Amino acid sequence: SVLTKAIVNADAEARYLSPGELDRIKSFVASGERRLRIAQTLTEARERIVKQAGDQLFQKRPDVVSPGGNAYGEKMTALCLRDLDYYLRLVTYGIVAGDVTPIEEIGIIGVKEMYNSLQTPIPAVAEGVRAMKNVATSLLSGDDAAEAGFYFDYLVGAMQ
Amino acid sequence: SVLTKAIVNADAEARYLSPGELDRIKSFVASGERRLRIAQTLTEARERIVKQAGDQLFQKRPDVVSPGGNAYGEKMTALCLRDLDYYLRLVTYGIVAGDVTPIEEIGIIGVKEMYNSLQTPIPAVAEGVRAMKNVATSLLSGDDAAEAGFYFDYLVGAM
């Protein structure tokens, strides 16, 4: 969260919170109501976002949904969708927090290592998140979409 | 090499070479002529090893050499073969050294980064090395083959 990050830096410096840090907290609390609305929109449309994103991903990459591919088979395909749903949930948590800290601890640290054991291709996963962003952006208002885009972009960047 | 490794451990402990360290040098230098022979065989059959392993690889992974696939196109296919040749040369260096130091510096440290940028799939480069092992091992005597095998396996491990 924004709050957590500010406090943590101050504690390390052993100082009370700076005027600038206080201002950033004020801005975040003002933005909060908007943020909650954006999160709610995505939560409602989640089933649709996952499905549309999945389709795009499978179209872009035949291989994942092929005998060689990891996603091949119904169970495997479901798991690939489940993963996409997990990442969407993370993004919503990020938007309300105002930071990627929630996202990062749950999903980005160790992601390479986890996927490498599974043998899932990381670039494909990134594509799925990109896909999800495109769908999500359409549902959101332009201003809202920009905010949401940053969080989506972070995920895509991290999964690389 | 074996030499370098032994000396480095001694220098760090600020001591002369142990009897054990000396023994390992003795064993290694006795094996030298045999090691050179193994390397020579593989060097001579290089073109065959690469090519036959390449063919098996393309059979094992049709996708890479497909219009969708990364390796698709003749230029791209050549590069994949060139890479296999590079890795084979590295293996021979390892065998004569009796250790991986040469191999490791030239071909494994930073390897994850380079292929990932290129987008070439590493979960398949390892397979190509496995393929090369099978071909190379068939041109060697059983004892020689085992020695050569270790170095091939190391590469597969390192990726």
Partner: peptide, 26 residues
Amino acid sequence: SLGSWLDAARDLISQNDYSQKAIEVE
């Protein structure tokens, strides 16, 4: 130049077509 690779690679592509095999789990 990788000339030897360039001719050998096209020779390999001409002798066999990879675009049908499909991956096998094995």
